[PDB]
From a paper:
The aryl hydrocarbon receptor (AHR), a member of the basic helix–loop–helix (bHLH) Per–Arnt–Sim (PAS) family of transcription factors, plays important roles in regulating xenobiotic metabolism, cellular differentiation, stem cell maintenance, as well as immunity. From the N- to C-terminus, AHR comprises a basic helix-loop-helix (bHLH) domain for DNA binding, two tandemly arranged PAS domains (termed PAS-A and PAS-B) for dimerization, and a transcription activation domain12. The ligand binding site of AHR has been mapped to its PAS-B domain. Here, we present multiple crystal structures of the Drosophila AHR PAS-B domain, including its apo, ligand-bound, and AHR nuclear translocator (ARNT) PAS-B-bound forms.
Among these ligands, only the binding of αNF was detected. The estimated dissociation constant (Kd) of αNF to dAHR PAS-B was approximately 240 nM. To reveal how dAHR PAS-B binds the ligand αNF, we crystallized dAHR PAS-B in the presence of this chemical. The complex crystals were grown under the same conditions as the apo protein, and the structure was determined to a resolution of 2.4 Å. αNF lies in the middle of the dAHR PAS-B cavity with a well-defined electron density and forms extensive hydrophobic interactions with dAHR PAS-B. In addition, two H-bonds contributed by the Y334 side chain and the G304 carbonyl oxygen of dAHR PAS-B were also observed. Compared to apo dAHR PAS-B, αNF-bound dAHR PAS-B undergoes a dramatic conformational change within its βG-βF region. Residues M331 and I332 undergo an approximately 90° rotation, resulting in the side chain of M331 flipping away from the cavity to facilitate αNF insertion. Here, we showed that αNF binds to the dAHR PAS-B domain at a pocket near αE, βH, βG and αD’. Thus, the binding of αNF in dAHR PAS-B is at a canonical position in the pocket of the PAS domain. However, HIF-2α M252 and Y281 are not conserved in AHR, and αNF-binding-induced conformational changes occur outside the AHR:ARNT PAS-B heterodimer interface.
Author numbering: 269 to 294, 296 to 381
Write the structure that this text describes.
């Protein structure tokens, strides 16, 4: 139930596992989709704090949030993020996701 993806430092998508493409339901549309565009409104500030924590410390722990698929439906995801460096400089973002059920996302939502 877990899949990986790679993003630029603005979290625009670069590549994604074929497992994740089947869940999200979007390859041609993957490069046109910048960051924070398909994240739920109630999660944008919390999700942006993980982006700040990623750039500040180099890693972001598992956080639960809602992402919109192609069908318009919201998907509960929990993602851990790590940085890839090019000579000590941050280069890309590597994310590890896990597809969650609605009850699983609600339980992790109540932990923050
Ligand atoms: O909306 C972006 C896309 C993605 C994303 C996730 C799964 C599939 C495709 C894009 O997630 C994030 C985004 C931006 C900031 C994030 C911070 C922490 C964790 C995830 C973030």
């Amino acid at each position: 139930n877990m899949f990986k993806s790679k993003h630029k430092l603005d979290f625009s998508l670069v590549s994604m596992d074929q497992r994740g493409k089947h869940i999200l339901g979007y390859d041609a549309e993957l490069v046109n989709m910048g960051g924070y565009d398909l994240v739920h409104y109630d999660d944008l500030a919390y999700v942006a704090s993980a982006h700040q924590e990623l750039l500040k410390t180099g890693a972001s722990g598992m956080i639960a949030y809602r992402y919109q698929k192609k069908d318009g439906e919201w998907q509960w995801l929990q993602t851990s993020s790590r940085l890839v460096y090019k000579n000590s400089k941050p280069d890309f973002v590597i994310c590890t996701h896990r597809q969650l059920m609605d009850e699983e996302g609600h339980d992790l939502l109540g932990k923050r």
